Write a protein that binds this ligand. Structure first.
Ligand SMILES: N[C@@H](CCC(=O)O)C(=O)O
Ligand SMILES: N[C@@H](CCC(=O)O)C(=O)O
Ligand code: NA
Ligand code: NA
Ligand code: NA
Ligand code: NA
Ligand code: NA
Ligand code: NA
Ligand code: NA
Ligand code: NA
Ligand code: NA
Ligand code: NA
Ligand SMILES: [Zn+2]
Length: 866
């Protein structure tokens, strides 16, 4: 399979302006009639090249003439000798029930639904399946009335009828031109939650949430979140919804999270369904974020779309930024920022050092579904947030307004967006654009000097990005480097130079530069890279006391958390090296004392405390090392947990008890208290066994909400407490019929520290609640094993790799998109020791030899084996 390149972009030879679709729907055989109005833009002799995959062509007409000048080739229908303007009519057949890849039109239980992003519409009919071709759609759906009483597509209902033999039909029209990736169709039998939102200018919008029969009890929070999203976009961005109806359909079988099809969003039911006994606080907040995200795409993605798929971050970085801002404004900004930073340093940085490393605007792609990445999404958003840091809110909004004023109704590029921001603000972003074209994580080194004779503080800041597997050449970036200088009392020292204030966002644009501040009356403790102002690794030689001082005094909550992370990083690294030499954990008393102070500080927000008392994950730990030892990292994380549990035992119990709440509420103060309480419980579970067992078992049995029940269960598994098997069986017996609730339990099984975890995981392939046909179950069992239990995945006998090869051998044929997400832990082999690399390479070579290797896997495997 052949790579496509960003520099090869060219405007299409033909446009389509209007398309009228009819579906004669049936799960075994659907007949699609597509009537497109086309216009030639290129040369008179250019054929029209339509994309199409796995279609059965029935007929081709041009202005009602059966056409003879065409041919089928791999992936395409090529139609020659055309007039300049014409009506194209294609009839073809497809088979939804055979669609195990869940791309195009497929079956989700008894429903039929679509997923067209990125290139799935070509699995439905022959089309210009590229996002710079925008057309007005009309969609008629004909189906069995008993099986498919609801027939939905984008926009509004314009026609409806009944036919003989128990069939009926509905026709839909959407007045906004769209690229075909935004097409959707749903047919099925649903319960429907109906509500309304009135926009600020008085437009009344009907809201309709479709769920499987019996799930209306789990719909109101998603409805509430949709209304919150619509109100927020109006308040913060000035943006209103532009249609009459907003439909969301929750489906169980879906490869991603959710999809922003105009007026008809299709969601993985994981990001819709919640009630207090089934969903944790984190599930509530994830439903909120994803609901918001898809809603925000209505402007950033739908009203202004992407010229080509290389511009994916134009809509994804910006929409992720918007969903973070939404979450942050409604909830705890510090907790949101901390968690996004954990993702960036712990998961995205690992991608940026991998064989799959790419810039947020990629230059080369084999399979575009492989580029729905942490880089494009999360790093994309950090790039948008850097623009915001450089411009300020008011200028940023002016940019947003100019972007829409120029580009509403069209496809655009990342470069168009940056240009709107530059032109509206008058800030120069020429150099800043390099963030779109350069891959890898920059390393920013800082040295300081305090001169008591002159009362000057000098920062010498350097940057470099190491070469990555995709790019040998790297250059300096425009890095917004936020600082704050603290005096010995903890007060902020005004930044200034030559008797003028200096902005606290430094522009670090060179390989090396110095910044000099005057009137620095006391040797400062610096807070560096405040609020993770750029997505970089920071190298500064902190003393432990500087870091504990920031923990006690820093103004921004994030800086207090970040200082704690830097304090812990030193001791993680220490203790991994010790573990490799057979030595036990060593931790200075003053480190333990710093975390004790956080536990007992009455003035700290409990949301912040809880994050400081949540140890970095094994993934965030791995990013501290050049060569990863996953066994050592897992045992050190445990040992550190046990050490803190012993040293802070009485304080932990005291805080655990003080944060008890009898009422359950999905409200941010209550969530914060509960996150603190459960963070205490996690340490307590690793303390003295008897007390641990009693506390955990009681919380599980007495909990009045899944957040508390699951925190207890998860602690029982992690600390291997006596009560573990009994609690795990109670949960299975109670919840086995509910796939989303069982996903939590599969994650716990997959991530268990027990010596026989792989044997248990293999056995769960036959569990009553598991099926290989459901991407959520695959992710929760197999994916959590490979990705979230690196100690077991990387067992020295190589068994983890062999298990993954076997699963991937099935998934390569069944669902390649899911296969390709799941291969990710194997393509990281160069981070591991030689004996592990050798085994991982042999696993990859076995996969490279599969019959009918999918393009999705081929791309990752070839880069990994290079
Ligand atoms: N554009 C969707 C994801 C669809 C996909 O992965 O294809 C979103 O980010 O919300
Ligand atoms: N799971 C324990 C630490 C052991 C480990 O994470 O490897 C905890 O989460 O608190
Ligand atoms: Na068009
Ligand atoms: Na139309
Ligand atoms: Na907030
Ligand atoms: Na594909
Ligand atoms: Na410029
Ligand atoms: Na210094
Ligand atoms: Na220093
Ligand atoms: Na840090
Ligand atoms: Na822990
Ligand atoms: Na099963
Ligand atoms: Zn998105």
């Amino acid at each position: 399979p052949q790579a496509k390149y960003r520099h090869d972009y060219r405007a299409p030879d033909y446009q389509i302006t209007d398309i009228d679709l009819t579906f004669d729907l049936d799960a075994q055989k659907t007949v699609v009639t597509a009537v497109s109005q086309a216009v030639r833009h290129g040369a008179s002799d250019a054929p029209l090249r339509l994309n199409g995959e796995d279609l059965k062509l029935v007929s081709v007409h041009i202005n009602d003439e059966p056409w003879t000048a065409w041919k089928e080739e791999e992936g395409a229908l090529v139609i020659s000798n055309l007039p300049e303007r014409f009506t194209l009519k294609i009839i073809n057949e497809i088979s939804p029930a055979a669609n195990t890849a869940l791309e195009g039109l497929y079956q989700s239980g008894d429903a039929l639904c679509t997923q067209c992003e990125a290139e799935g519409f070509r699995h439905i009919t022959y089309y210009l399946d590229r996002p710079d071709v925008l057309a007005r759609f009309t969609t008629k759906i004909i189906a069995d009335k008993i099986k498919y009483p609801f027939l939905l597509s984008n926009g509004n209902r314009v026609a409806q009828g009944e036919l003989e033999n128990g069939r009926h039909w509905v026709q839909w029209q959407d007045p906004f031109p769209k690229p075909c990736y935004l097409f959707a169709l749903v047919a099925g039998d649903f319960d429907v939650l109906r509500d309304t939102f009135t926009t600020r200018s008085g437009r009344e919008v009907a809201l309709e949430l479709y769920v499987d029969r019996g799930n209306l009890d789990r719909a109101p929070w998603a409805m509430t979140s949709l209304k919150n999203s619509m109100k927020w976009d109006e308040e913060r961005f000035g943006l209103e919804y532009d249609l009459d109806i907003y439909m969301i359909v929750a489906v169980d079988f879906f490869n991603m999270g959710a999809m922003e099809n105009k007026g008809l969003n299709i969601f993985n039911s994981k990001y819709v369904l919640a009630r207090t006994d089934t969903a944790t606080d984190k599930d509530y907040l994830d439903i909120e974020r994803v609901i918001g995200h898809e809603y925000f795409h209505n402007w950033t993605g739908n009203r202004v779309t992407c010229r080509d798929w290389f511009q994916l971050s134009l809509k994804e970085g910006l929409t992720v930024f918007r969903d973070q801002e939404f979450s942050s404004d409604l909830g705890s900004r510090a907790v949101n920022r901390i968690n996004n930073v954990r993702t960036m340093r712990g998961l995205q940085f690992a991608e940026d050092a991998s064989p799959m490393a790419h810039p947020i605007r990629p230059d080369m792609v084999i399979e575009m579904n492989n580029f729905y990445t942490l880089t494009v999404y999360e790093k994309g958003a950090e790039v948008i947030r850097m623009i915001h840091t450089l411009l300020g809110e008011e200028n940023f909004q002016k940019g947003m307004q100019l972007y829409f004023e120029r580009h509403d109704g069209s496809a655009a590029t990342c470069d168009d967006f940056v240009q709107a921001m530059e032109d509206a603000s008058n800030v120069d972003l020429s150099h800043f654009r390099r963030w779109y074209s350069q891959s890898g994580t920059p390393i920013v080194t800082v040295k300081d000097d305090y001169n008591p004779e002159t009362e000057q503080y000098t920062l010498t800041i350097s940057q470099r990005t190491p070469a990555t597997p995709d790019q040998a050449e790297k250059q300096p970036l425009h890095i917004p480097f936020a600082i704050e200088l603290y005096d010995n009392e903890g007060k902020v020292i005004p930044l200034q130079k030559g008797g003028h204030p200096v902005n606290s966002v430094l522009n670090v644009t060179q390989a090396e530069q110095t910044f000099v501040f005057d009137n620095v009356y006391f040797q400062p403790v610096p807070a560096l890279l405040c609020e993770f102002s750029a997505p970089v690794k920071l190298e500064y030689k902190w003393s432990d006391q500087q870091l504990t001082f920031l923990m006690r005094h820093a103004r921004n909550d994030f800086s207090r958390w970040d200082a704690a992370q830097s304090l812990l990083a030193t001791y993680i690294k220490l203790n991994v090296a010790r573990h490799q030499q057979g030595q036990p954990l060593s931790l200075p008393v003053h480190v333990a004392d710093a975390f004790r102070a956080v536990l007992l500080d009455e003035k700290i927000d409990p949301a912040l405390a809880a994050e400081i008392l949540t140890l970095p994950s094994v993934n965030e730990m791995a990013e501290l090392f050049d060569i990863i030892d996953p066994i050592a990292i897992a045992e050190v994380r445990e040992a550190l947990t046990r050490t803190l549990a012993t040293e802070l035992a009485d304080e932990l119990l005291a805080i655990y008890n003080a944060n008890y709440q009898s009422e359950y509420r999905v409200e941010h103060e209550d969530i914060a208290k509960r996150t603190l309480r459960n963070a205490c419980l996690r340490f307590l579970a690793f303390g003295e066994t008897h007390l641990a067992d009693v506390l955990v078992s009681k919380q599980f049995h007495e909990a009045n909400n899944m957040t508390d029940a699951l925190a207890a269960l998860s602690a029982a598994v992690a600390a291997q407490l006596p009560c573990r098997d009994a609690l795990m069986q109670e949960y299975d017996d109670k919840w086995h019929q509910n796939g989303l609730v069982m996903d939590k339990w599969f994650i716990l099984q997959a991530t268990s520290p027990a010596a026989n975890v792989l044997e248990t995981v293999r056995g769960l392939l036959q569990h009553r609640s598991f099926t290989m046909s459901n991407p959520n179950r695959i992710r929760s069992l197999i994916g959590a094993f490979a990705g979230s239990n690196p100690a077991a995945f990387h067992a020295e006998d190589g068994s983890g790799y062999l298990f993954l090869v076997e699963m991937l051998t099935d998934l390569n044929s069944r669902n390649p998109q899911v296969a390709s997400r799941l291969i990710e832990p194997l393509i990281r082999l160069k981070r591991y020791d030689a004996k592990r690399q050798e085994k991982m390479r042999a696993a990859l070579e076995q996969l490279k030899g599969l019959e009918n290797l999918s393009g999705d896997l081929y791309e990752k495997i070839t880069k990994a084996l290079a």
